[PDB]
């Protein structure tokens, strides 16, 4: 399965002009388009090689869409001030994510159309693509409004139609790169500590897509040892990195195994020091 997702942010800056409005689009973990209202001559712009050959009509249509959305989000930010009885002097953020998860046979697995205000859930289209989940009393105003307007119908039509159709085209355009499942290359490093014990660190490098699970285990028992798991991070070349550590007694290193699961692996990896 694959995903097409757009991430939209407006941030007000009272006293410094109109809000900054931005969009970024992704296929799976690969960015491919951007918009930034603060750029000189703002236009929708390519950020992956396999989108650069969409014709001029594509960029004109997406730029027009972004500039209409920008006006919408200006209105939304002003309305949020009224809903929350907030002063006109503060900076606030409105975020929006929309997109589709699609199986390789074209089946829509899940559609998303959801918002956050000042970094917290505001309103979200439910998995049925028919009803809304509102996070507070302000969002209940929006829910009533969009229910009476039938807003979800148009949203669902995008998620079941346009989103699915264009994801298919993008995967065709970028089939030389987007379909890969590069498995992690893994190893364990060993670091004696001054305290007399040992840090074992299990590394996973060079993998795509970004989803991965790294786990330290013994022989089924729950590990009470001190552990640490860093956030998955981009290498910058289209692959990702992660590590996971455990502090173990000196002389007991061989009791611990690191287990690695990833879409690109035919079998999960098990590694020891």
């Amino acid at each position: 399965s694959h995903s097409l997702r757009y991430f939209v942010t407006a941030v007000s800056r009272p006293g410094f002009g109109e809000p900054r409005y931005m969009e970024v689009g992704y296929v799976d973990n690969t960015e491919f388009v951007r918009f930034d209202s603060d750029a000189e001559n703002p236009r929708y712009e390519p950020r992956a090689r396999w989108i650069e050959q969409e014709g001029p009509e594509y960029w004109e249509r997406e730029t027009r869409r972004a500039k209409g959305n920008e006006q919408c989000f200006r209105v939304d930010l002003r309305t949020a001030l009224r809903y929350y009885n907030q002063s006109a002097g503060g900076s606030h953020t409105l975020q929006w994510m929309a997109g589709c998860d699609v199986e390789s046979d074209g089946r829509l697995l899940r559609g998303y159309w959801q918002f956050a205000y000042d970094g917290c859930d505001y309103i979200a289209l439910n998995e049925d693509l028919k009803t809304w989940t509102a996070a507070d009393m302000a969002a209940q105003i929006t829910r009533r409004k969009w229910e009476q307007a039938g807003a979800a119908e148009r949203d669902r039509a995008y998620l079941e139609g346009e989103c699915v159709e264009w994801l298919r085209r993008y995967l065709k355009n970028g089939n030389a790169t987007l379909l890969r499942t590069d498995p992690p290359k893994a190893h364990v490093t060993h670091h004696r500590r001054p305290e007399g014990d040992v840090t074992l660190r299990c590394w996973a490098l060079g993998f795509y897509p970004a989803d991965i699970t790294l786990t330290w285990q013994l022989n089924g028992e729950e590990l009470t040892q001190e552990m640490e798991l860093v956030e998955t991070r981009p290498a910058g070349d289209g692959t990702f990195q992660k590590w996971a550590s455990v502090v173990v007694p000196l002389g007991k290193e061989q009791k611990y195994t690191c287990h690695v699961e990833h879409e690109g692996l035919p079998e999960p990896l098990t590694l020891r020091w």
């Binding site: 991430f7 951007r34 917290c120 860093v230 981009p234 590590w243």
Partner: protein, 99 residues
């Protein structure tokens, strides 16, 4: 409604002194989105640092990548300095080759 940035400083490839590489500063889990990020060599601002487009995660927090070309040596020190409203003063994180 303020999230403090998490900062990782790391090379693209396993580092070898004398071998060209890329140094990354990956900054995540922050809100609001306004942030200032600088990469430093021996305490001095590195002139050519590229910034990815900012985006946000499932939990709505923002993330961004800074990176620069470099050849690691025995004598040079690298760091990433991040200024965000959630922090009183900018935070400097040094490159740890084992992390």
């Amino acid at each position: 409604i303020q999230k403090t940035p998490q900062i990782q400083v790391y090379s693209r490839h396993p580092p070898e002194n004398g071998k060209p590489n890329i140094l990354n500063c990956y900054v995540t889990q922050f809100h609001p989105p306004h942030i200032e990020i600088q990469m430093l060599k021996n305490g001095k601002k590195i002139p050519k640092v590229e910034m990815s487009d900012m985006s946000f995660s499932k939990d709505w927090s923002f993330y961004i990548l800074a990176h620069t070309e470099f050849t690691p040596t025995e004598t040079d020190t690298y760091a990433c300095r991040v200024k965000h409203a959630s922090m009183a003063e900018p935070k400097t994180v040094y490159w740890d080759r084992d992390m």
